[PDB]
Design a protein around this ligand. Structure first.
Ligand code: ZN
Lengths: 176, 119, 187, 106, 19, 65, 72
RNA sequence: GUUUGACCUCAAAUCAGGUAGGAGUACCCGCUGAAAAGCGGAGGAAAAGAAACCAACCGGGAUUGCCUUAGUAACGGCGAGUGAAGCGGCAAAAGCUCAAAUUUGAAAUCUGGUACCUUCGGUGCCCGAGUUGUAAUUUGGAGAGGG
């Protein structure tokens, strides 16, 4: 398939053709709004490996942010704007000195293709409301820093959690 | 000395509307009688009668609307179930029982068996 | 309006700036009569529509329903091939006898390797003008690619001379100017 | 500050769970068939222990597939590795004894 | 043992299978 | 600056494909999934849920009058 | 007067020249509430009013949101 | 051909169907933050969760929580004091899905409308969506083609 070509070509960003397309598209998107709807993913392979499918119930927004993180704030903007949609994920496409550009995949839990088709029906659950608001996305888990490793220690929110471990005292019926 | 519900179920709608007109005239008379009267028990009966007439009329109208909308795969929202927030939403049974074809083949191939240990 | 303003300001900012030579291979494309005969070729090899498919299915199914199991014989379907991953998939065997490539795709990067890929695989590619004209011959809105592998014996001699025609008209004419940086002249 | 006043209560509730789950799982045990596995960490390396799951290769040596063995209630770990002989053999004997004592309904 | 024997007969009971 | 593109890698032509993927069976025989859809329609016609098209034209010829 | 009858809460705390209710926060869609004023939140929660819909909820939850009747 | 049409984009709909808001907020999750307050977002739990793990052993084996590790390691005008984690015992135990090579001998996929029917749906027909990829199969523990 052709996706391996797109990925390997995508890894060479400062190559002449990609910076050409980047330099055209940053001006072209600069013409448009801060937030708008893209007809199709400009980086389809990246959208696939983030989970995009080309059917009804998949909405692609393109979002502009000024230079929390920038990516998570970009997700929060389209989460606030299209509340009926659930945010699947997001990825970088383009940037300027003034703005970075992100391309965000959102999924509607109202469309019957999404309400059926059991690979994706889990996102219809109301526990998946506003994953970007709770940092439950990929960039949210990265900025929370949730993995396995000794490199991963008590960091910020978990720090208050282990402050909570220092703040509360546990007593049994029979004192130990 | 009052109306019955089941007696009003048999009647045509014009009979019910004329009965309503009769009860409203009777109410208008009983107000003129009651502005002289300290306590008139009949007006308390006839307002319940007006209420039952309105009940039967509205019920017949709603069931007629339901019968004309019976076949369609839709309904006016007021005629639908009320239940609550989000029991409207997020799943049907069919939309929850729905499973992929691969896990379907897996459960056909290896279902959870019934066994008894120490035998 | 805004969108008219942008779609007119587009293709100005492109040509004003230096395009890389892996682009502007596009619009160095096939001329009038050769694209015309290419379309006359591929309309001989239209794929089956969903209606025609379902119709033949109902015919043979009513045959088996009577039963009246007539025979078990059909040579093969021959048609154009149009799925992009399927088009790339027909290369690297190789199976693509001819490939048409649309010049206009908005994610151009979907397409840019295909001339070099058919160049190294030796596949007779040709850059066609307009993916809508590809979609018309393949019952889609757009197609952006058009591969063709299997040809009847009635058409095989026309195929080879069309290949030689394209390799004369495309590979000889535009090969050196393909290497050159296009555009760059202001508007 | 927190006091476990419910220590008496939760146990009762837990046994209610151990009742209620058992009601649904009426012939079968509540727990799966776990491996007998020797511990790490030289303080504990003489100690043997209950392990998570056996392996693919061991269940194949028992004479069945792990996909089927999960339906029989045998806990299976892919990411474990069998490196000791006697551990492997004792757990194979354990699997065989478990196979001897089950009766499976069609 | 008794109900063990009964379930052992039931699991030992061949189901009416179809070719 | 700018300079024309070097075609060092294109000019060597591969006489063989990349992958030694074995050819599947279904590329040579009539298509199976077609036939499964055929038998689906056969089961629907045996249940009469689908009318044969000759019978449909017979229906339309009478219904026009 | 400094304040006016609020259209939302009816408290006589709709300030005039600020065009706002100091009590409830009309016309802002979110209601004003302060956690330091926990006693103030106590005076205005659910349960103070009629709960015209909210009374009969859990009873329907006890009945499983049944429909119709059984004539017998 | 000054015509006609494919697209593509962008508008408009008292067009059809849906959905967002607010309240509460004990528990949860994010953001901000002093000498907590605040903000945002959920649920009956939430979060986390199936190793780019821990170890150095006769190795262990998703996550979660309890007891112990332990007031130890470590940190700290090494002052005030701050303050873990591996292992072990227990509770509970459950694992799975994508994205990469073609179905090319037939997009096999789905929304919607309509007609019926046994209606949390089914069947038929028709618009559409979709090859700039929807289905089946395959997630390394491999797997696929065949025989
Ligand atoms: Zn107010």
């Amino acid at each position: 398939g052709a996706y391996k070509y797109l990925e390997e070509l995508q890894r060479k960003k400062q190559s002449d053709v990609l910076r050409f397309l980047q330099r055209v598209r940053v001006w072209e998107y600069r013409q448009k709004n801060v937030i708008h709807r893209a007809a199709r993913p400009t980086r389809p392979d990246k959208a696939r490996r983030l989970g995009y499918k080309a059917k009804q119930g998949f909405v692609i927004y393109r979002v502009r942010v000024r230079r929390r993180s920038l990516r998570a704030t970009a997700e929060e903007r389209v989460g606030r704007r299209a509340a009926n949609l659930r945010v699947l994920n997001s990825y970088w496409v383009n940037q300027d000195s003034t703005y970075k550009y992100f391309e965000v995949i959102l999924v509607d839990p109202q469309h019957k293709a999404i309400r059926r088709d059991a690979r994706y029906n889990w996102i219809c659950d109301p526990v998946h409301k506003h994953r970007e608001a709770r940092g439950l996305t990929a960039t949210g888990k990265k900025s929370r820093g949730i993995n396995k490793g000794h490199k991963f220690n008590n960091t910020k929110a978990g720090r208050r959690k282990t402050w909570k471990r220092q703040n509360t005292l546990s007593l049994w019926r029979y004192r130990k | 000395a009052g109306v019955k519900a089941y007696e009003l179920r048999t009647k045509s709608k014009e009979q019910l509307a004329s009965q309503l007109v009769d009860l409203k005239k009777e109410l208008a008379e009983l107000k003129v009688q009651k502005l002289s009267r300290p306590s008139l028990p009949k007006i308390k009966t006839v307002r319940k009668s007006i209420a039952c007439v309105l009940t039967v009329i509205n019920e017949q109208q709603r069931e007629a609307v339901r019968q004309l909308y019976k076949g369609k795969k839709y309904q006016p929202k007021d005629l639908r179930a009320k239940k609550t927030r989000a029991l409207r939403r997020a799943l049907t049974k069919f939309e929850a029982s729905q499973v992929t074809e691969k896990q379907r083949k897996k459960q056909i191939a290896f279902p959870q068996r019934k066994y008894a240990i120490k035998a | 309006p805004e969108y008219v303003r942008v779609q007119r300001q587009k293709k100005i900012l492109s040509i004003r700036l230096k395009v890389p030579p892996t682009i502007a291979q596009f619009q160095y494309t096939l001329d009038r009569n050769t694209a015309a005969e290419t379309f006359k070729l591929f309309n001989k090899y239209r794929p089956e529509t969903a209606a025609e498919k379902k119709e033949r299915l109902t015919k043979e199914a009513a045959a088996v329903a009577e039963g009246k199991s007539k025979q078990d014989a059909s040579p093969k379907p021959y048609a154009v091939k149009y799925g992009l991953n399927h088009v790339v998939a027909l290369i690297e065997n190789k199976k693509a006898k001819l490939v048409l490539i649309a010049n206009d795709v908005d994610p151009i990067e979907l397409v840019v390797f295909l001339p070099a890929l058919c160049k190294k695989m030796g596949v007779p590619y040709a850059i066609v003008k307009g993916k809508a004209r590809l979609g018309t011959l393949v019952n889609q809105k757009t197609s952006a690619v058009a591969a063709l592998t299997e040809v009847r014996a009635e058409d095989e001699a026309a195929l080879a001379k069309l290949v030689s025609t394209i390799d004369a008209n495309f590979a000889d004419k535009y090969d050196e100017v393909k290497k050159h940086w296009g555009g760059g002249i202001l508007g | 500050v927190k006091v476990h006043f419910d220590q008496a209560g939760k146990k009762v509730s837990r046994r209610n769970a151990r009742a209620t789950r058992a009601a649904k799982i009426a012939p079968r045990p509540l727990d799966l068939l776990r491996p007998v596995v020797r511990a790490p960490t030289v303080k504990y390396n003489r100690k043997v222990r209950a392990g998570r799951g056996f392996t693919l290769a061991e269940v194949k040596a028992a004479g069945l597939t792990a996909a089927y063995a999960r339906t029989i209630g045998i806990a299976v770990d892919h990411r474990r590795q069998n490196r000791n002989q006697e551990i492997f053999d004792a757990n194979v004997q354990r699997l065989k004894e478990y196979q001897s004592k089950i009766i499976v309904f069609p | 043992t008794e109900v063990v024997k009964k379930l052992e007969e039931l699991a030992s009971r061949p189901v009416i299978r179809k070719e | 600056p700018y300079e024309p593109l070097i075609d060092w890698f294109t000019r060597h032509e591969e006489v063989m494909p990349l992958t030694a993927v074995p050819e599947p069976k279904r590329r040579f025989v009539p298509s199976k999934n077609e036939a499964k859809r055929v038998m689906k329609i056969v089961r629907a016609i045996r249940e009469g849920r689908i009318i044969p098209p000759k019978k449909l034209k017979e229906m339309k010829x009478x219904x026009x009058x | 007067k400094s304040h006016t009858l609020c259209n939302r809460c009816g408290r006589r705390s709709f300030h005039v020249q600020k065009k706002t209710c100091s009590s409830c926060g009309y016309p802002a869609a979110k209601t004003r509430s302060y956690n330091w004023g926990a006693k103030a939140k106590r005076r205005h929660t659910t349960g103070t009013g009629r709960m015209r819909y909210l009374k009969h909820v859990s009873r329907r939850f006890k009945n499983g949101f049944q429909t119709g009747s059984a004539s017998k």
